[model samples]
Target chain A: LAADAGTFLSRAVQFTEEKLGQAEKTELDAHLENLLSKAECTKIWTEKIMKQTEVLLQPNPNARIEEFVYEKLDRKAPSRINNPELLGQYMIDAGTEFGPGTAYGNALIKCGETQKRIGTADRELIQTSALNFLTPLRNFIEGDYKTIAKERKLLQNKRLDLDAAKTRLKKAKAAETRNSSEQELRITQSEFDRQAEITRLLLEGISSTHAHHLRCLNDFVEAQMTYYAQCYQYMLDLQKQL
Target chain B: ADAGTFLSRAVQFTEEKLKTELDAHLENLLSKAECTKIWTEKIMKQTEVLLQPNPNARIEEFVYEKLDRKAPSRINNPELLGQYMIDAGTEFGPGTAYGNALIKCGETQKRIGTADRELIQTSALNFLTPLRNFIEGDYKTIAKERKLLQNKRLDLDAAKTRLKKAKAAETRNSSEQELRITQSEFDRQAEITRLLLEGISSTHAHHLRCLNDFVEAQMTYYAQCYQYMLDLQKQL
Candidate 1:
């Protein structure tokens, strides 16, 4: 609410530009139109069901026989077979309104429901679209935002785990140093690997995520390869950064 | 006079608390005998300079004490007055001890600061959440504290290990094994207590770390205050 009017208007104009915001907006506009059309069609089908229900409520016992005789009436007649009073006409003051205005109220209700359904479906599509768009844009900000975030976390965790693991490894290795037992060394190695694996998977997830983000930014094969290389370099220096 | 009175009071306080504060772990790590020797030597050196009647009367003028009078001053020793005050065994000799304490105090404070810096920067960066909580030692203590709240969990995990270990030690009891286990437990508790006392509880460790980092960064963007302070002290 505190936003300056000039800034808001300028941003609106900027976002509407074809190069920036409209790159994805054109496809989005088509989607919205498709939703509105579907809503209209659904409203039409619902109206048909409403009419059929009205017919079931009719009171005349000879109505069926009368409808059969009236089926042969001239086009000008307004009998049940000629042209029954529309369910659309009974609801309100829409009797003489042109182009079936009386039919629109129920259609509007159906239209609202259809719009709401489309909205729910749109949220899922929006997530997919954002992931697709951001996966590349994130590369623009940094080589691998998620990967860098993850690996750094892993290396730090490993340092702490190693603080715990150091005593056992030292004891096992010291035992080996005195007796030269291959089994003891192997035990130490296995323990080391357990802690190391935790760090490794965390690091691996980071590198792969980062590479994927960078690769998304690549339009050409050569550029893609270069981005991949940059990701690798980022992983290499991660532990060394202050 | 002020310095001596402060020393007398501090020493008395330390003696009173030393039983609890300077436990076996503290003793084993830094022996009292070794500390006394270092402290005494340090005091004598500092006092020698601070208490010296000016070798050149100009240097001894009480107020405008220059480096010209003290023998070490002639050598242009970097921290001569500091070293003299340490050795001379005077009121200011304790002042030298205070300086050393302050430096060491700064160092202990620095570790907490470093810990603080890591916690803040990591938390700010997010996905590092679990690791930050661990390094700051916040999560485990909370987990332990929460266990203390429930009645059924009073010995929540003790029953499983207690039966096996209690039986094993019951038959082949040896003082050596008991001592080792006791020492191990002591160290673990001591480490936890030290961390907790430094305001390194699950909550406070992280809060201080976060606050220190925030203030440090906000106070001077990208410039490290600790390094600047060290440099400042050297010149002073």
Candidate 2:
């Protein structure tokens, strides 16, 4: 809700003056500034890691390019086809045509089956990494970071209002003690302190975000661990068969 | 590169195609040769796609390869991702547990990336080279000889047609001489093509060896990735 026409005019006047560096500005303490910096750092890296992990999981250039357009169109893309399964099918088809009687044919069929299994493992890795890890990081950026930014903006507006009231009180004292100016300053001071506390509390909540992200990080690593071992096992079995 | 057959060869070959199962044994062997070529080419292309994955990069590599110049070294995606992780984690303060864990993950990721490069290079040389040679070298020879055989066949048939139409003594003598020459050339090309087609058996044997090389390299690549990830798990 906006203030009345008169109150709105004064806050607008105060807001621009402070913005242009012509008016008194409120400054945050060192500890709170540190908290804000850490929150921003987390936001930056969370996005970078999420995007890079995508490159690792689905390196197919066409599919990645396809995703880029689909996102711009705000449409869901069809699931991309993986190379291993495609190559696996080619091997199986060629081998079957070559006939199971030959050594090359038999070996290819077995290898093809192993490759298809590896494809399945890759699918599972993508699912686990996306649901448990990527989703959380996205939620933090979208949900938590947006809230912190809004609250910080609100805190800035309140600081200007509080400073304007203080300036008015000084003018009142210079002329004579005006009861109206004194009461206005009192109200503004309390409201400004309250908004600052709200902003501080929101920034402090980043500790909890770090905890969530750390857990997601572990899940990410664990999924890769399982996926890699699955690939190794499949190939090992294939080698032994040959 | 061109077989450069006569216009008469093309005309004779068209009718010959309609009329000839003359060398049934050679025809059957030729079929096997074709089957091997198609499948070999298909497998070669599919493996290439698997190796590069990126179409743009494949085209880039192709141009460089065509230019007979080595392309710039490519950094694997996982390796760069690992570096980003390490940078991010160090900034987060590696004194923290998550930060330390991130650095560990990054190190192993880079290791896996290098191992993948090794696998691709090894497989390309040992596994892919032989398959490519079968198409570019072995099959090219077979194809050329087959073309020559077809041209010989057309020449032979054209001479027979000329002899059939000959009426005067001079016409008969010339036609007969041409017939003899064409018949000998045709027989010579037939034998050459037969031997080349039969070489399919040897191609299959060579392909089997190359397949073994591919599997071995893939197994090593998988084993290395698993080991690296395992180490990261232990470190974490």
Candidate 3:
């Protein structure tokens, strides 16, 4: 087959150098501009949706061990996130590590610009959900830590009462032999089981809280990183043509 | 200078002389490598077969027979729940966080703190190598092997069928015990079919998962590896 003029024309890209140069290549340039704008819009919408999906997937605060245990296990006091809007505002105010590095800052700016142009109703909802996802983790940990301390205090009080009763029972028996030993053993075992359960829940509460936070951070970074990669690749490919 | 040249030539000649023997030794490795590849396939096959929803071998019996299923009796033997946690902690340590961060994006090492980023990047890269190799290297081997092995099994099945039919037609049995023998023979055949299906299912499934995981892991591994390698090359 001949590599003919038609082949060259098919392969050829039309160039416009108005904004690119002096001539009004707006129609030709408009096609490229439309493509870039469409690409940006698609990227923003897709990322926003992905972030929402990530939010829906994240473990909820009400599902925290403290809430479940407080309601079910008859534990003290449910946790609270007093200042969630303040937290997001804090992240935005502080310019968190999520926007660090040249690659990342550019991505943030681009995503922000896209949001401004598109007026992402979805983004505010997603960011709000993400903040809701994060705030609970901190609250859960702090609440659980308090619960653990309270439980420990309660356990220590019970231990003292048990000891006092045992002492009285021993004095009343006028001996410390097999019968006394059996009573003591039963009490000790019961106490041990109680103590063990509390310790296990304490550790679990701490772990779950940390796990959720880590997952939230990981999901956030990955979503943003993917957006950055896609945009950077598009730019790189575009530059090669230029 | 004269001593050096004569000695260097002598060394070179000795090296050339050893080359044939060295190649022969290397050939032994080549055979072992093939054997290893085959053995790996067998292990992979068996693992997949057992993992399958249905298998030739009774998985419950196999698990009970092979692994400890006894209830924990003491603090040291804590429930399998705690044991799994300890195992996970070792396998996915605090160090894994950095690798995870990189996978999530931290190519510039900013999300990873100053002290930890370099170490994390190295760890992440090291962690992903096997996955990448499995993706870029092992999957092709598995696909090739699957085709070859399946063909071989089909050949065996044909040979076995001919032999079975021949025995059934040719052999004559005592009438009294004939029913008992026939029933026993049917049972044995059923068992063989079960075992073969079970083995094949498990081994293949594990390898398939391994293949998929490798493909995903390779993307992170190669991207990080290339980025790191470029940085190192520039340093030189």
Candidate 4:
């Protein structure tokens, strides 16, 4: 509850924008609108089901029918449907409120059973949305993030190597003959400079890659929220009709 | 320094840091264990109507009626059943060893029409649930964390051997380059040991906090269960 909707997404977007330019920001906004529209369209089909259920309820004022219709509508309506952690706990809490063995509890079970029959299409859409995000998410995290981590590790090792060489070069600097000491110093300096440059490139790579990921993650979360809002509104209407 | 003294220092360092934490954690567990045991006993008392029986019924006859006829032979013996309950508590409370034993014993003791199914069902729920949580959940987690700390200490000891070797090799290096390489290796090993020590301390502290949380959750669960039992008693 503390992290619901805009508060969390706004903070994430703010962090992403701190690193991204105007062009990227404008692009994300459009992508966000597109996802929200897709979510809004999902409600149309759900609303059709609601209308049918209303007509069926006219012939029979059955509690089972009402509960079944409520469940179907509830699935389409979203507060945070994509979040399994939140949704899973939310459903459990709802069940607890209804109380085990109570009529509400029994109704919830029956509704769940009935909803399962038509859950395939909704499940595929939700899963596909998740799958779309995951491919890029893994690429960024595993590819660039992993590369940065490995590079940093290599830089650390190389720095240590240079430090060891520098120590010898320091004592070598005190050698009686200038030629050999200069030669050793030049060789050590070359190694040190090379490693320093490697470390610098790795750091730059990490910073840019990290910002890119932040923007991508921000888009995914914002779009998810928009989708959920439409779903939540659909449920509200279904309940009202019931 | 030989491997012997390096290992000794490793053990000493681990003890100096780890022992106090482990002691404090175990002490906290002891307090929780006491709280849980007391709460369990209190709930058991509250369920006396279910635990105790009809005045005319013999203990064996009561058990047979409550449990199925095929109940284990020892189910008829109060002294043995009490021992089983104690063992069950130590093992993980009701739903696990004790509860399963009781259920199987009851099922076997199936006295057909004579069995008091409601009494058996209520008694199992009232008795085993709390005990099961303490044993299977909280207690096991705490023990596992302690084992993890011990394993981390062993890893620190293993790293010490590499450091000792690096330090010794520096003296054996014939050239300045060789000496520098050996010294670098020694310093790298030292850094690694430092990181390992820091990691051990951080993870140990984190696990301790989690263990404390587990204890707190258990306490809350028991308190709620106690209230529920009182409410049920009032209804009865």
Best lDDT among the predictions, by candidate number: 2
Real contacts recovered, all predictions: 0.00, 0.72, 0.00, 0.00
Q: TM-scores of all models?
A: 0.14, 0.88, 0.23, 0.26
Candidate 4 lDDT over residue span B146-223, tens digit each: 455555545545454445555555633434455455445544544443343334234323332332332233233323
lDDT of 3: 0.40
Give residue A133's error in model 3 in angstroms.
4.9
Q: Which stretches of candidate 3 lie over 4 Å from their true place?
A: A1-154, A162-215, A226-242, B1-92, B95-236
Q: What is candidate 2's lDDT per residue for B1-236, written digit by digit as tens? A: 24456766888999999822448889988887887788878878888888888888888988999999999988889899999999998999989887898898889889988998988899889988988877888878888888777777777778878899999999999999988887778778888888887878888888998998898898888888888887887887
Q: Which of 1 and 3 is the better model by lDDT?
A: 3
lDDT of each: 0.36, 0.84, 0.40, 0.41
Q: After superposition, how far is residue A198 of candidate 1 from its true place, in Å?
A: 9.4
On TM-score, who's better, 1 or 4? 4
- Provide the TM-score of chain A alone for each candidate, in the order shown: 0.20, 0.84, 0.30, 0.42
Best by TM-score: 2
Please say which candidate is ahead in TM-score: 3 or 4.
Answer: 4
- Tens-digit per-residue lDDT, A1-242, candidate 3: 56566433322222222224432221223433343343333233223333334423322434444566777878776543322222223223222232344332233233233223222332444465557544544454356556766765655444443444444354464455647766865776487458646655554444344355456555543443443344334334322322
In Å, residue B35's CA in model 4 sits off its true spot by 42
Candidates 2 and 4, the one with greater lDDT: 2
Q: Could you say which candidate leads in DockQ? A: 2
The full ranking of all candidates by lDDT, starting with the best, is 2, 4, 3, 1
